[PDB]
């Protein structure tokens, strides 16, 4: 089957929600797979999010070796970024959803 259809449906359902600025899927290397932003902004998000989630995973593992990161989200004054991490032995992926919290429907 075509995995593109499922990926597209998930991306559109995520982008539907209020104020969602965009969506990115990032590999273990800090490189985006699919993005709805421009190339430069997508690259900067990929780098920053990958580094931050690596440090956060290290801190969480130090705090509790039997506990692992499941979700992250940072709210700024104007935008909020939600990071969904997945650390499987075969692949490490991050889902970045950038949204405007204060947007009015």
């Amino acid at each position: 089957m075509v995995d593109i259809a499922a990926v597209d449906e998930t991306f559109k359902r995520l982008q539907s929600h209020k104020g969602v600025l965009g969506i990115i899927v990032i590999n273990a290397e800090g490189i985006a797979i699919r993005t709805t932003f421009d190339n430069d902004l997508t690259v900067q998000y990929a780098a920053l999010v990958s580094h931050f989630t690596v440090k956060a995973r290290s801190a969480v593992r130090k705090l509790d070796g039997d506990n692992d990161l499941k979700f992250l989200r940072i709210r700024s004054k104007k935008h909020e970024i939600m990071i969904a991490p997945e650390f499987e032995r075969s692949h490490e992926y991050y889902l970045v959803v950038v949204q405007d919290p204060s947007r009015e429907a």
């Binding site: 290397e29 800090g30 990929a46 780098a47 990958s50 580094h51 690596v54 440090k55 290290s58």
Partner: protein, 86 residues
């Protein structure tokens, strides 16, 4: 984060040493200034000072380095630059 060697006037063993030291610095620190300080002090301890290290993601530099004493690589998306001079 695999080390992405951009430029290397080095040997293989002490390239691996540079990669390991940079990894340790990144693990222990969170500031490019501190990471460069750790890298430079460790390489002064190990490999006949004086070395110089620059860590960061936005810089363009032109330096003169001693032969077999220069590396410029990427760990993830962070650029780390080493060169021996003086």
């Amino acid at each position: 984060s695999k080390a992405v060697i951009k430029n290397a006037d080095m040997s293989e063993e002490m390239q691996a040493d540079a990669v390991d030291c940079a990894t340790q610095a990144l693990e222990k620190y969170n500031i490019e200034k501190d990471i460069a300080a750790y890298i430079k002090k460790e390489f002064d301890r190990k490999h006949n000072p004086t070395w110089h290290c620059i860590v960061g993601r936005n810089f363009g530099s032109y330096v003169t380095h001693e032969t077999k004493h220069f590396i410029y690589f990427y760990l993830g998306q962070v650029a780390i630059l080493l060169f021996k001079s003086g």
